[PDB]
Each structure stands twice: as structure tokens, then as C-alpha cells.
Coordinates of C-alpha atoms in Angstrom, one line a residue:
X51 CA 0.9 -11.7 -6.8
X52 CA -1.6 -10.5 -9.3
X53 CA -0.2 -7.4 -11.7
X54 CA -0.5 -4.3 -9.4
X55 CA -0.9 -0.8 -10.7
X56 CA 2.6 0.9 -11.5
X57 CA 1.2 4.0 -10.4
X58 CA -1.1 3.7 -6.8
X59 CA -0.6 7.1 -5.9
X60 CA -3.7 7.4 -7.7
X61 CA -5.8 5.0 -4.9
X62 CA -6.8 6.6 -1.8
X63 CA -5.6 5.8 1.8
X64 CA -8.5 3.4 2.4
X65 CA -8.4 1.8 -0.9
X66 CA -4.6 1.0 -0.4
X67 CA -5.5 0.0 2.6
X68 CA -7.6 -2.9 2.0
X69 CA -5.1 -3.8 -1.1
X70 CA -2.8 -4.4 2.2
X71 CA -5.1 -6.5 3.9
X72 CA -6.0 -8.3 0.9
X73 CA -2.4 -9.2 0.6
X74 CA -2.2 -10.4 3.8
X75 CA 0.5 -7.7 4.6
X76 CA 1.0 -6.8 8.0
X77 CA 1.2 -3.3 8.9
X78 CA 3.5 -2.5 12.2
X79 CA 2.0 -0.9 14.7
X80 CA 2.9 2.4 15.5
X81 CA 2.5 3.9 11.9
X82 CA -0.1 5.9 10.4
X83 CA 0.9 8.1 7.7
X84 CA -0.3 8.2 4.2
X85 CA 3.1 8.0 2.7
X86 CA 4.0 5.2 4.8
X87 CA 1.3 3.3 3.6
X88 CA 2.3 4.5 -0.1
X89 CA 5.7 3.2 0.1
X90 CA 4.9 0.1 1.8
X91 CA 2.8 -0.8 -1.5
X92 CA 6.2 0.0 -3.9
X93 CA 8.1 -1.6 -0.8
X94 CA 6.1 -4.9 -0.6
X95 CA 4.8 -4.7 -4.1
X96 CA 6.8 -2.5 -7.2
X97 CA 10.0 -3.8 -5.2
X98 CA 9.4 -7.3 -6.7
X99 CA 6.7 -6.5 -8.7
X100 CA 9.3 -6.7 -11.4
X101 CA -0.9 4.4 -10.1
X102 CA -1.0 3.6 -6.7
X103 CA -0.9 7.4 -5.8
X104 CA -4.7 7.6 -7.3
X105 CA -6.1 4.9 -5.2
X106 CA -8.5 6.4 -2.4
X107 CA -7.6 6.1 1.0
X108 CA -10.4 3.2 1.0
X109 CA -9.3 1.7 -2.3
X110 CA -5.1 2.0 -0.9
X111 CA -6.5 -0.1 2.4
X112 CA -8.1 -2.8 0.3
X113 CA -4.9 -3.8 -1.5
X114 CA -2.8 -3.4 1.9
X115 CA -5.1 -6.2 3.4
X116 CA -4.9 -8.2 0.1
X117 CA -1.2 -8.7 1.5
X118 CA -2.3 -9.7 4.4
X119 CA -1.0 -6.8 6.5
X120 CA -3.4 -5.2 8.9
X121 CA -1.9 -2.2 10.2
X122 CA -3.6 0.8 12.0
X123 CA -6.0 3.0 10.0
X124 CA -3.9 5.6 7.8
X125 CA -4.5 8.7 9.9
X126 CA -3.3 11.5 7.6
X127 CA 0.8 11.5 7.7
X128 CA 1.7 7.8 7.7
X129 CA -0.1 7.0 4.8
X130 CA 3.1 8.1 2.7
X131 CA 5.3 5.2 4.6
X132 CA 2.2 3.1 3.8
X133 CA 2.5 4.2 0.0
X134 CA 6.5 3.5 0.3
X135 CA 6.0 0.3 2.1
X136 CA 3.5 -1.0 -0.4
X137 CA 6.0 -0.7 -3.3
X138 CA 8.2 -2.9 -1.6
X139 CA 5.5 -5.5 -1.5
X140 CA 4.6 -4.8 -5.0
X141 CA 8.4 -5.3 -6.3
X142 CA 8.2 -9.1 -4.6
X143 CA 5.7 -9.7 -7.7

């Protein structure tokens, strides 16, 4: 669980999408908002972790496939669950 950014609000949707893939987390089907996707980082991440909101949306997907999660592309109002989701994972580190 290498140290994640406090703050990936700063990635974009793709880039916190790959950080998802790269961590192998799996994204559920049936979601595609950019908050989704935020959360899920502080979900997955920041949760057990212990800015994510400036990651692009390419950056945000990178880290979401780090996790390992492949989920559907962020269309343009899941990415926030994704951006809730990924905190989760985050607080696991």
C-alpha cells in the first residue's frame, strides 16, 4: 500500500482511474460518477491509509487500477462515488 496522496481531488477522473486498476480494486458495475470514483479512493485508500481531488480523470483511473478494481469508465457524475470509494481504499493503508 504505497503512501497515497492525502489530497486526490487534485488527480483527474482518468488518472484516478488507473490508480484503481493499479490497485487491483474492483469497481462495481453500474457506477460512473466522478465522485463515486473520488470516494472510493478515501473509501479503499485514506480509510486505512492511516490531493486526490487534483488528479486528472486519467491520472484518478491509474491509481483505481493499481487496486485492482476495474470499474466502468467515470462518465461525468459517478466519478465523485469513485473519489469517495477510493478513500476507503486508501484508509486500508
Amino acid at each position: 500500500m504505497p503512501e497515497f496522496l492525502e489530497d486526490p481531488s487534485v488527480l483527474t477522473k482518468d488518472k484516478l482511474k488507473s490508480e484503481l486498476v493499479a490497485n487491483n480494486v474492483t469497481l462495481p458495475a453500474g457506477e460512473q460518477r466522478k465522485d463515486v470514483y473520488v470516494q472510493l479512493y478515501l473509501q479503499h485508500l485514506t480509510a486505512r491509509n492511516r490531493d486526490v481531488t487534483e488528479l486528472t480523470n486519467e491520472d484518478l483511473l491509474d491509481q483505481l487500477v493499481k487496486y485492482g478494481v476495474n470499474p466502468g469508465p467515470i462518465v461525468g457524475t459517478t466519478r465523485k462515488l469513485y473519489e469517495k470509494k477510493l478513500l476507503k481504499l486508501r484508509e486500508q493503508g
